[PDB]
Ligand binder design. Structure first.
Ligand SMILES: Nc1ncnc2c1ncn2[C@@H]1O[C@H](COP(=O)(O)OP(=O)(O)OP(=O)(O)O)[C@@H](O)[C@H]1O
Ligand SMILES: Nc1ncnc2c1ncn2[C@@H]1O[C@H](COP(=O)(O)OP(=O)(O)OP(=O)(O)O)[C@@H](O)[C@H]1O
Ligand SMILES: [Mg+2]
Ligand SMILES: [Mg+2]
Lengths: 504, 515
């Protein structure tokens, strides 16, 4: 298939390289080399060093076996290193691509999923996708190539028997993955849907513990956590069992085929051609080892198909309703605005519409306007890093001046590390008014020609709110001269100035 | 249990090796004879297959039991961590969360290899290896005495490798917690970064964190695979040593043929379980360190609370430090500068943390001795930002329990005019933190949740935020009516409409604990 959206999704985010895949396949083929060559050079006291005393033959056999073991071990180490490196690279690329997709989408789409779902989809799902890369791609390509080559080779010695051998091998290596996949898919869907509900209620308990404790609803959240953990465990066991039996059946097929091949090889096989013994030890061994490796590959196919489906449904969610259209407002380079109205009229919508009009979509790198929304994020980083999210080239003197002029000089003087205090918890490490003042300082530090503030004097002091609002709307107090300031507020003083764009 | 299944597996392996050795010896000593009755080639294969089937069945049963036990243990550990961390003071919770979250979600899941392939491997190594040595010594004691010389090396190598990987395990765990926490925080702040235009600059730091994590994982993997290769070489050399010995003693005819085959077949059985244990140790190390971190998080003492219960009716709350007495039936407004422990005072009245200013007495009995479970049943608390999880409006209205009288409370607060304007009514989907509703509407949803509830004490931390004058007046009228209904109301507003709406005003000042 080529038109599967899941396939395109895992092709972008999990971008692979052909070189590493080919190298891993070659390493597997070469690891089959020792299996080929255990008896390919010292079948008996004829092939190697013509005829030799028994003790010499024993020493040669022991040293050859040990050397082949060393070679196989080194080759396996190299192959494991390459495969796991490819998996880790793919997982890192998938995580980065997922975050970039989230950041490119409209911001309201990134807030559709809870924190627990985000954790469950940015962890185990990405791990499953990397696992599909490695484990899905290597044994399968190995099995297909080995089976096709072996069937083509054996088509010469006995095409009539070659057809039977091909039929048997295809039947085994189709029924075992079929059983594995049909057992894995249905159970793994339930397991994934339970895992991304166990941690939703279990991160809800962690971020909002005091409110749930006071409301008496934390025991329920923990109970749901336990119940979904139990359901996930049962689903995983149900996934594991039939895949186990379906993978065990190839092993019995391998044993039966090897025994029958040996028995046929003790029937006039050394005569006519002795290399027939080598071919007979090469074909079933490789083909059935690949067949035994196949069921885990099929299980990984199903598991990461589910994971990729979850990732795609995370990337593209259904949109919500659209904010109402608002009247266009003409702005002047230096104007002051006091957009007001009731508590559902659309002042924030008008601020965002004004910003969108001023920015003029993409193609305008110098961003003219920025909206400082009231619910802006306070990160779990230092105070300086929190203030530098707007302008990254601001010296500490400017930061300290802004903090002092927004009323946080005494707060900063009492910080253990000054501008380097970590602010553990984000908005939980400060107080409402202090967080509001920090957001105002963020706005002040900015270099945007137009600054659009959304309820900037909420949760502020009785003696500082009115003065701060008047200074914001004064053309020379906090923002000076060539800066346009638009403020959507609920506490405009009855006696004041500057135009009003009240809504309805 | 582990013992019975492992005994069955070890016995089956030893018997299969001995039977195979005896049949190859019989075929070698009788190349083309013995056919046509007691062939020693037809009836031995059925015994070999039966032993293989029994071993497979025992392995399946052991795996099922191990998986069930691992699931139970992981669930219990996660429950312990959640019950310990979430029931602590908010400052400690904010300090150690995003670290309990990692061990609960992605950390404790690594304990599955510990129970499902490490402990069974250790038990099998402890059972099969001495048994295989004893059987080999019984069949050919020289071979067993010769192999026992390479045995002590492998445990010493394991000791060295564990000593050298214990620290890397913890380093990887810390890197994982840091990456998960920073990624969650960055995703939480996407609207802010997009508003300021610096949205594409966070992808770079996400890339750096992912690259660091990948490098650490690759380092550990490399160490683990090198250790596995060394163990394989050790076991192979130990087997080849006795192979040489028996081959030399067989070429010159000193020993019987069947004993030689038995020794050669039983030699790899001595060393295979040790290789399996060495392979399983590295897999189980991550679960081991995650469990150690989980117990470290859980092992923390919480302040004790008594069993005192306040009498029936609306109580009296007194804070002698600020000379504040909140009488029932009256509204008390707490006001002060931005940062003088007002929300902290509310949370101390609740009992979540210690009092910033002196002791708090509720109806005489101190808060510290009150039964928190029963005390919280007489309270209705509205914090600065009410909890609004993703979902519908109806699901968010029922987040903090049920509301008896939702329609009347919505009419009184003013939330009925919010549900009416929504096209889908109380079924519109909401984003994280209330996305899909405005700030005034989120505040009114929180006020509906808080005001409408069976409670005697009301604690509100600036309830009329993001509300215009008319809505402010309506909400204050509702609060005053609730107070008139015989309840204790403690508002923390510091604005003129809020201040001129209470029968008592407390002007709590600075220099209490923190400014
Ligand atoms: N995605 C959305 N996010 C927020 N509000 C939305 C959204 N879609 C529609 N709306 C609606 O848009 C209308 C105007 O909301 P807006 O936030 O612009 O109002 P506001 O005047 O700022 O109010 P408030 O003072 O309460 O903040 C409201 O009915 C709100 O519910
Ligand atoms: N982890 C923390 N959580 C909360 N407050 C903290 C923390 N660490 C320090 N603080 C400080 O606690 C002090 C008291 O803040 P609190 O929120 O109790 O004040 P407040 O009276 O509610 O003020 P506001 O008007 O800002 O709401 C502040 O100086 C705040 O910065
Ligand atoms: Mg708004
Ligand atoms: Mg506060």
């Amino acid at each position: 298939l080529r038109h599967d959206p899941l396939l395109r999704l895992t092709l972008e985010l999990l971008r692979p390289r052909l070189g590493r895949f080919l190298l891993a396949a070659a390493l597997g083929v070469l690891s089959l080399g020792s299996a080929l060559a255990l008896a390919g050079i010292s079948a008996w006291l004829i092939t190697r060093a013509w005829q030799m005393p028994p003790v010499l033959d024993l020493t040669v056999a022991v040293v050859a076996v040990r050397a082949l073991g060393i070679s196989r071990g080194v080759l396996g180490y190299c192959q494991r290193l390459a495969s796991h490196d490819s998996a880790l690279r793919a997982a890192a690329n998938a995580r980065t691509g997922l975050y970039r997709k989230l950041a490119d989408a409209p911001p309201d789409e990134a807030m559709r999923l809870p924190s627990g779902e985000l954790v469950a989809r940015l962890g185990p799902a990405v791990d499953e996708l990397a696992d599909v890369l490695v484990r899905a791609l290597l044994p399968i390509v190995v099995a297909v190539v080995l089976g096709c080559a072996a069937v083509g080779v054996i088509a010469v010695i006995s095409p009539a028997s070659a057809a039977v051998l091909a039929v048997c091998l295809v039947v085994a290596g189709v029924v075992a993955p079929a059983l594995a996949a049909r057992a894995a898919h249905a159970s793994e869907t339930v397991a994934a849907e339970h895992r991304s509900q166990r941690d939703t209620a279990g991160m809800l308990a962690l971020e909002h513990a005091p409110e749930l404790r006071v409301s008496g609803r934390l025991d329920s959240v923990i109970a749901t956590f336990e119940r979904h953990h139990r359901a996930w465990g049962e689903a995983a066991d149900r996934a594991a069992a039939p895949a186990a039996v379906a993978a065990a059946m190839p092993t019995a097929a391998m044993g039966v085929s090897v025994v029958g091949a040996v028995i046929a090889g003790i029937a006039l096989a050394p005569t006519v051609a002795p290399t027939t013994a080598a071919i007979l030890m090469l074909l079933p061994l490789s083909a059935f080892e690949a067949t035994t490796a196949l069921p885990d590959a099929a299980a990984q196919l199903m598991r990461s198909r589910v994971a990729a489906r979850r990732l795609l449904e995370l990337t593209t969610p259904t949109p919500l309703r659209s904010r109402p259209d608002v009247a266009t407002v003409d702005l002047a380079p230096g104007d002051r605005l006091a957009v007001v109205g009731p508590s559902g009229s659309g002042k924030t919508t008008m601020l965002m519409a004004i910003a969108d009009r001023l920015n003029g979509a993409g193609g305008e790198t110098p961003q003219r306007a920025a909206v400082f929304a009231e619910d802006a994020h306070l990160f779990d980083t230092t105070v300086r890093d929190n203030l530098l999210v707007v302008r990254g080239d601001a010296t500490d003197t400017e930061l300290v001046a802004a903090l002092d002029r927004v009323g946080l000089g005494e707060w900063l003087a009492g910080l253990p590390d000054g501008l380097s205090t970590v602010l553990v918890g984000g908005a939980a490490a400060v107080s409402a008014g202090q967080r509001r003042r920090l957001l105002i300082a963020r706005a002040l530090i900015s270099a945007f020609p137009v600054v659009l503030l959304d309820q900037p004097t909420e949760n502020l002091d009785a003696g500082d709110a009115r003065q701060m609002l008047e200074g914001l709307l004064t053309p020379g107090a906090l923002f000076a001269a060539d800066r346009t300031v638009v403020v959507a507020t609920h506490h405009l003083p009855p006696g004041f100035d500057c135009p009003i764009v009240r809504c309805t | 249990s582990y013992f019975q299944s492992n005994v069955v597996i070890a016995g089956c392996t030893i018997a299969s090796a001995v039977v195979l050795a005896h049949i190859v010896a019989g075929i070698i000593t009788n190349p083309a004879t013995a056919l046509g009755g007691e062939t020693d080639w037809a009836p031995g294969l059925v015994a070999l297959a039966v032993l293989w089937s029994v071993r497979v069945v025992a392995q399946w049963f052991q795996g099922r039991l191990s998986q069930r036990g691992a699931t139970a243990v992981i669930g219990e550990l996660s429950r312990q961590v959640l019950s310990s961390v979430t029931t602590s003071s908010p400052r400690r919770l904010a300090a150690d969360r995003d670290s309990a979250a990692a061990v609960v979600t992605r950390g404790l899941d690594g304990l599955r290899p510990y129970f499902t392939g490490y402990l069974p491997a250790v038990v099998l190594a402890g059972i099969l290896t001495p048994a295989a040595l004893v059987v080999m010594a019984a069949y050919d004691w020289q071979a067993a005495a010769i192999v026992v010389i390479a045995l002590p090396l492998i445990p010493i190598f394991m000791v060295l490798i564990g000593l050298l990987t214990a620290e890397r395990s913890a380093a990887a765990l810390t890197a994982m917690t840091t990456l998960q926490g920073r990624m969650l925080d960055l995703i939480a702040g996407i609207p802010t970064l997009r508003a300021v235009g610096r949205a594409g600059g966070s992808v770079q730091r996400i890339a750096e964190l992912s690259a660091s994590h990948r490098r650490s994982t690759m380092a550990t993997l490399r160490i683990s695979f090198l250790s596995a290769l060394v163990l394989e070489l050790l076991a192979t050399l130990g087997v080849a040593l006795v192979a040489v010995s028996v081959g030399l003693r067989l070429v010159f005819g000193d020993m019987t043929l069947a004993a030689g085959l038995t020794a050669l077949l039983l030699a790899p059985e001595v060393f295979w379980p040790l290789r399996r244990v060495g392979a399983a140790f590295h897999a189980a190390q991550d679960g081991k360190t995650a469990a150690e971190q989980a117990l470290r998080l859980c092992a923390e003492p919480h302040p004790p609370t008594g069993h005192e219960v306040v009498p029936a009716g609306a109580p009296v709350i007194e804070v002698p430090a600020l000379k504040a007495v909140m009488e029932p039936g009256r509204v008390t407004v707490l006001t002060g500068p931005n940062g003088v422990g007002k929300s902290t005072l509310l949370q101390a009245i609740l009992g979540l943390q210690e009092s910033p200013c002196g002791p708090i007495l509720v109806a005489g009995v101190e808060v510290g001795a009150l039964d928190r479970s029963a005390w919280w049943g007489r309270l209705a608390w509205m914090p600065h930002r009410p909890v609004l999880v993703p979902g519908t409006v109806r699901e968010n209205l029922e987040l903090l329990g049920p509301v008896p009288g939702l329609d009347e409370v919505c009419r009184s607060v003013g939330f009925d005019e919010v549900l009416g304007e929504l096209p889908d009514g109380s079924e519109t989907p909401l984003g994280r933190g209330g996305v899909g509703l405005s700030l005034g509407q989120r505040q009114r949803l929180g006020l509906v949740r808080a005001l409408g509830a069976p409670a005697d004490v009301l604690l509100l931390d600036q309830p009329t935020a993001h509300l215009d004058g008319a809505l402010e007046d309506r909400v204050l009228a509702a609060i005053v009516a609730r107070a008139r209904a015989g309840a204790t109301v403690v508002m923390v507003g510091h604005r003129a409409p809020v201040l001129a709406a209470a029968d008592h005003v407390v002007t709590m000042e600075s220099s209490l604990v923190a400014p």
